[PDB]
Design an enzyme around this catalytic site. Structure first.
Site, PDB file in Angstrom:
ATOM      1  N   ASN A 262      -3.587  -6.756   6.533  1.00  0.00           N
ATOM      2  CA  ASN A 262      -2.700  -5.600   6.513  1.00  0.00           C
ATOM      3  C   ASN A 262      -1.717  -5.532   7.719  1.00  0.00           C
ATOM      4  OD1 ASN A 262      -1.783  -2.905   6.349  1.00  0.00           O
ATOM      5  ND2 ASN A 262      -3.717  -2.153   5.755  1.00  0.00           N
TER       6      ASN A 262
ATOM      7  N   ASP B  31      -0.370  -5.897   2.373  1.00  0.00           N
ATOM      8  CA  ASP B  31      -1.436  -6.897   2.573  1.00  0.00           C
ATOM      9  C   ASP B  31      -0.980  -8.326   2.187  1.00  0.00           C
ATOM     10  OD1 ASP B  31      -3.013  -4.554   3.137  1.00  0.00           O
ATOM     11  OD2 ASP B  31      -3.915  -4.622   1.225  1.00  0.00           O
TER      12      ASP B  31
ATOM     13  N   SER C 209       2.664  -0.015   4.356  1.00  0.00           N
ATOM     14  CA  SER C 209       2.165  -1.309   4.826  1.00  0.00           C
ATOM     15  C   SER C 209       1.980  -2.276   3.638  1.00  0.00           C
ATOM     16  CB  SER C 209       0.832  -1.126   5.568  1.00  0.00           C
ATOM     17  OG  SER C 209      -0.183  -0.696   4.674  1.00  0.00           O
TER      18      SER C 209
ATOM     19  N   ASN D 294       0.832  -1.214   0.000  1.00  0.00           N
ATOM     20  CA  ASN D 294       0.000   0.000   0.000  1.00  0.00           C
ATOM     21  C   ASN D 294       0.859   1.253   0.000  1.00  0.00           C
ATOM     22  OD1 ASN D 294      -2.435  -1.640   0.555  1.00  0.00           O
ATOM     23  ND2 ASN D 294      -1.544  -1.827   2.613  1.00  0.00           N
TER      24      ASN D 294
ATOM     25  N   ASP E  43     -14.353  -6.346  14.992  1.00  0.00           N
ATOM     26  CA  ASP E  43     -13.811  -5.122  15.595  1.00  0.00           C
ATOM     27  C   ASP E  43     -14.736  -3.923  15.444  1.00  0.00           C
ATOM     28  OD1 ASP E  43     -13.674  -3.699  13.158  1.00  0.00           O
ATOM     29  OD2 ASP E  43     -11.534  -3.971  12.905  1.00  0.00           O
TER      30      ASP E  43
HETATM   31  C1  LIG Z   1     -10.123  -3.558  17.737  1.00  0.00           C
HETATM   32  C2  LIG Z   1      -9.682  -2.772  16.504  1.00  0.00           C
HETATM   33  O1  LIG Z   1     -10.309  -1.510  16.520  1.00  0.00           O
HETATM   34  C3  LIG Z   1      -8.169  -2.588  16.352  1.00  0.00           C
HETATM   35  N1  LIG Z   1      -7.886  -1.438  15.465  1.00  0.00           N
HETATM   36  C4  LIG Z   1      -6.468  -1.077  15.539  1.00  0.00           C
HETATM   37  C5  LIG Z   1      -6.136  -0.498  16.903  1.00  0.00           C
HETATM   38  N2  LIG Z   1      -5.886   0.967  16.962  1.00  0.00           N
HETATM   39  C6  LIG Z   1      -6.250   1.589  18.274  1.00  0.00           C
HETATM   40  C7  LIG Z   1      -7.498   1.035  18.931  1.00  0.00           C
HETATM   41  O2  LIG Z   1      -8.454   0.514  18.300  1.00  0.00           O
HETATM   42  O3  LIG Z   1      -7.527   1.143  20.170  1.00  0.00           O
HETATM   43  C8  LIG Z   1      -6.090   1.804  15.748  1.00  0.00           C
HETATM   44  C9  LIG Z   1      -6.979   3.028  15.923  1.00  0.00           C
HETATM   45  N3  LIG Z   1      -7.986   3.259  14.882  1.00  0.00           N
HETATM   46  C10 LIG Z   1      -9.165   3.999  15.351  1.00  0.00           C
HETATM   47  C11 LIG Z   1      -9.534   3.943  16.838  1.00  0.00           C
HETATM   48  O4  LIG Z   1      -9.726   2.866  17.466  1.00  0.00           O
HETATM   49  O5  LIG Z   1      -9.653   5.073  17.402  1.00  0.00           O
HETATM   50  C12 LIG Z   1      -8.197   2.103  13.997  1.00  0.00           C
HETATM   51  C13 LIG Z   1      -9.592   1.734  13.611  1.00  0.00           C
HETATM   52  N4  LIG Z   1      -9.663   0.331  13.151  1.00  0.00           N
HETATM   53  C14 LIG Z   1     -10.869  -0.363  13.637  1.00  0.00           C
HETATM   54  C15 LIG Z   1     -11.835   0.581  14.310  1.00  0.00           C
HETATM   55  O6  LIG Z   1     -11.576   0.991  15.465  1.00  0.00           O
HETATM   56  O7  LIG Z   1     -12.858   0.914  13.681  1.00  0.00           O
HETATM   57  C16 LIG Z   1      -8.393  -0.482  13.143  1.00  0.00           C
HETATM   58  C17 LIG Z   1      -8.283  -1.700  14.070  1.00  0.00           C
END
Ligand SMILES: C[C@@H](O)CN1CCN(CC(=O)O)CCN(CC(=O)O)CCN(CC(=O)O)CC1
Ligand SMILES: C[C@@H](O)CN1CCN(CC(=O)O)CCN(CC(=O)O)CCN(CC(=O)O)CC1
Ligand SMILES: [Cl-]
Ligand SMILES: [Cl-]
Ligand SMILES: [Cl-]
Ligand SMILES: [Cl-]
Ligand SMILES: [Gd]
EC number: 3.2.1.17
Length: 129
Positions: free
Chosen positions: A59, A52, A50, A46, A101
């Site tokens: 990812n 995939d 990153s 990407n 998630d």
């Molecule tokens: C459980 C998943 O949520 C993991 N997540 C990665 C973890 N981090 C920080 C965190 O989520 O605590 C990234 C933060 N970011 C936005 C945010 O969370 O505020 C990503 C959003 N997505 C999913 C989503 O949140 O909708 C990516 C997947």
């Protein structure tokens, strides 16, 4: 490994993807086709650095460690290379965490644009399941 359609359906059903968070099995088969062409060794870079990996193109920004995506997480606790194996166990387990998630299967761009709202049962039609 490049899987056949019915072969993959059977493998995915055996690891419990059929109706996982309400998504019927044809949704998962449809996503894999358009993300990877059913090829476990698929990789795509990407623009943010990153990459995939694998049959469902997971990812390196959030989900696996590839040693070159600085300041990323590894929330599936695996090297990104385990996601290229002929055994899909690691891909399936990691995907269970993603689809849970909050964004559901919308996390997979190709699913949203090519599978969402279509006849997804067509992708497992004819398979002995
Ligand atoms: C459980 C998943 O949520 C993991 N997540 C990665 C973890 N981090 C920080 C965190 O989520 O605590 C990234 C933060 N970011 C936005 C945010 O969370 O505020 C990503 C959003 N997505 C999913 C989503 O949140 O909708 C990516 C997947
Ligand atoms: C930091 C921001 O992410 C703040 N965040 C509020 C804080 N909490 C939990 C937490 O984030 O630690 C909310 C729980 N939650 C998602 C989740 O976190 O699992 C709601 C969705 N969004 C963001 C998203 O997650 O995409 C709300 C914005
Ligand atoms: Cl289906
Ligand atoms: Cl890294
Ligand atoms: Cl397998
Ligand atoms: Cl959902
Ligand atoms: Gd998040």
């Amino acid at each position: 490994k490049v899987f056949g359609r019915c072969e993959l359906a059977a493998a995915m059903k055996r690891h419990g993807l059929d109706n996982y968070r309400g998504y019927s099995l044809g949704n998962w088969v449809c996503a894999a086709k358009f993300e990877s062409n059913f090829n476990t060794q698929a990789t795509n870079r990407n623009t943010d650095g990153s990459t995939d990996y694998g049959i469902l193109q997971i990812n390196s920004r959030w989900w696996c460690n590839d040693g070159r995506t600085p300041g990323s997480r590894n929330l599936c606790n695996i090297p990104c290379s385990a996601l290229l194996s002929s055994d899909i166990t690691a891909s399936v387990n990691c995907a269970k965490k993603i689809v849970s998630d909050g964004n559901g299967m919308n996390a997979w761009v190709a699913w949203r644009n090519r599978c969402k709202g279509t006849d997804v049962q067509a992708w497992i039609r004819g398979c002995r399941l």
